[PDB]
Design a protein around this ligand. Structure first.
Ligand SMILES: *[C@@H]1O[C@H](CO)[C@@H](O[C@@H]2O[C@H](CO)[C@@H](O)[C@H](O)[C@H]2NC(C)=O)[C@H](O)[C@H]1NC(C)=O
Ligand SMILES: CC(C)CCC[C@@H](C)[C@H]1CC[C@H]2[C@@H]3CC=C4C[C@@H](O)CC[C@]4(C)[C@H]3CC[C@]12C
Length: 538
């Protein structure tokens, strides 16, 4: 039944094994905020007046100024200090939740599969009665001291670490930070909740006085004892209706079709490590100048701080709309920015990921509709990616080859160097014409046809086929071949002095930038002595 279900989920359980996990997550979010969340490096990241192209999830999330942004990581650290102790716990979770999902939703490049877990585990632990055992609220309130907690404090937490352990096994069918310690600290949730009363019995008698209470736990208000109420019934709409989306959001890719791509899509909730096989031999930002039509080949990573905008279609459009307002400061009024990104596969198969003729500033991208201007990965060329081993094994060590796949209307202007003598082409699928601009002659190639190329010149290979044409570049470095023819006990001490710079610089710079709100701004020559005070090694 439904009334029988909520009586099961609100059954009084022991509050102790939740309260170790409240501590060991609240303590591992004390070590985390200096190291990984970037309190050591907010100054170079959210600097005042600096033109940086952000990548937030919602585009209305504009980051605060750096005077205020050191307060947001302080409320996060005041929140993760009361969630450590268990102090003022329904406020110290909301002071850790709301400035985490403002920080974590502010940088799409900062998403991964462990810093999304802490944004989940701080959302469950906000609604949970974790401060019943071993708290300060227990040492200030009697009815929050060693009192029985409902089972949905344990059923959700056993169901969240189940799904992370389950979907990461199912996603295998196709320097990680604190993740190696939280999943070791979360493993005492799957044990019986009597385990923090077992090791204190193995402890001596005099050590039992600073350790918390050992007796049998009292009943509480928040349970159903052998009909439930409004607090009790919403623990059954949070046990399942939260765990339903946690079984659904890793497979919510086909509804967020503006985000998803060839391999992963929007990284974060996937639970599977991303592959580094791309290696990206090209980017070419090509903007049209306003009102003149002139061409500017812009530098690739000018107004960004990460290289995640090239592998994904969502971060490109936000980078193409942030560049659409910055470039008027450099005499480019209305830019028409066309990206030409050659995503390379592990050793071969170089092909574009975005359409280089379309204006990414104006072209429509909706988060649930299909993205139009993404070129598809040629998965018909994945049996040709097995055909590479036919060509690789038949050829020797000194003939190196990369493969190219090209779409209609496009061309690859490549410069063969002086080192790459005896360089040939083989057009496999489709029809392309190779034109040497030094020789000014077109030559239409046929399927399987072999043709050499001159060294030290440019060449343009235009696609005239209506199908995606593909070809390969056998090359030999003839000048390189003519060159061939002629302690642990002190590492951790070095690791300790590294991390004590992180704790010192993050603590010192926070109090400097908190002075500007309460005590106003100092002089520029005053703070110059203050900022180099922190950057030194202690
Ligand atoms: C070789 O022939 C191709 C096919 O006509 C030429 O490519 C076209 O060039 C014109 C003018 O430059 C462009 O307007 C077309 O868009 C091009 N076609 C495609 C499919 O891009 C190419 O210019 C010729 N080679 C040289 C060196 O001139
Ligand atoms: C932006 C400032 C004001 C804070 C506002 C709070 C918002 C942005 C945050 C706080 C906690 C967040 C939720 C925490 C947990 C989850 C489960 C996850 O699987 C999907 C997102 C979802 C459902 C989040 C949605 C957005 C959320 C409600």
């Amino acid at each position: 039944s439904w009334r029988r279900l909520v009586t099961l989920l609100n059954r009084p359980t022991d509050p102790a094994s939740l309260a170790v996990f409240r501590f060991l997550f609240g303590f591992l979010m004390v070590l985390d905020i200096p190291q990984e969340r970037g309190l050591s490096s907010l100054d170079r990241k959210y600097l005042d007046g600096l033109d940086v192209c952000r990548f937030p999830l919602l585009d209305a999330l504009r980051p605060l100024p750096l005077d205020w942004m050191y307060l947001v990581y302080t409320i996060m650290f005041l929140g993760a200090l009361g969630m450590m102790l268990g102090l003022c716990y329904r406020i110290s979770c909301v002071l850790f939740l709301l400035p985490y999902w403002y920080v974590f939703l502010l940088d799409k490049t900062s998403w991964n599969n462990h810093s999304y877990l802490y944004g989940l585990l701080a959302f469950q632990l906000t609604f949970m009665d974790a401060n019943h055992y071993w708290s300060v609220d227990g040492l200030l309130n009697a009815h929050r001291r060693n009192a029985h907690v409902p089972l949905w404090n344990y059923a959700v937490l056993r169901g969240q670490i189940f799904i992370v352990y389950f979907i990461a096994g199912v996603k295998k069918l196709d320097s990680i930070g604190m993740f190696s310690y939280v999943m070791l600290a979360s493993s005492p949730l799957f044990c019986s909740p009597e385990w923090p009363r077992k090791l204190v019995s193995y402890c001596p008698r005099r050590l039992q006085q600073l350790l918390p209470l050992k007796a049998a736990p009292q009943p509480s208000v928040s349970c159903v004892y052998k009909k439930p109420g409004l607090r009790h019934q919403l623990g059954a709409a949070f046990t399942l209706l939260y765990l339903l989306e946690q079984l659904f959001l890793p497979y919510s890719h086909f509804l967020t079709q503006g985000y998803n791509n060839w391999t992963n899509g929007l990284y974060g909730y996937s639970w599977d490590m991303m592959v580094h096989s791309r290696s990206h031999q090209h980017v070419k930002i090509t903007y049209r100048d306003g009102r003149t039509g002139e061409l500017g080949y812009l530098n690739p990573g000018v107004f960004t701080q990460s290289r995640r905008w090239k592998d994904h279609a969502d971060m490109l459009k936000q980078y193409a709309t942030c560049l659409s307002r910055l470039l008027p400061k450099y005499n480019v009024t209305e830019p028409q920015i066309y990206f030409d990104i050659w995503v390379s596969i592990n050793d071969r198969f170089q092909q574009r990921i975005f359409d280089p003729r379309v204006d990414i500033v104006q072209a429509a991208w909706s988060p649930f509709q299909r993205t139009s201007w993404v070129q598809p990965l040629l998965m018909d060329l994945s049996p040709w990616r097995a055909k590479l081993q036919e060509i690789k094994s038949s050829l020797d060590n000194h003939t190196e080859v990369v493969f190219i796949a090209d779409f209609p209307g496009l061309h690859l202007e490549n410069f063969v160097s002086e080192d790459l003598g005896n360089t040939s082409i083989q057009l496999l699928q489709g029809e392309v014409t190779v034109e040497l601009v030094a020789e000014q002659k077109n030559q239409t190639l046929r399927e399987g046809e072999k043709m050499q190329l001159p060294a030290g010149e440019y060449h343009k290979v235009y696609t005239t086929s209506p199908s995606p044409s593909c070809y390969m570049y056998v090359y030999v470095n003839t000048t390189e071949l003519a060159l061939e023819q002629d302690p642990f006990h002190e590492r951790f001490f070095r690791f300790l002095l590294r991390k004590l710079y992180v704790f010192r610089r993050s603590f010192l710079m926070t109090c400097i930038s908190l002075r500007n709100l309460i005590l106003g701004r100092p002089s520029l020559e005053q703070l110059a002595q203050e900022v180099t005070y922190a950057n030194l090694r202690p």
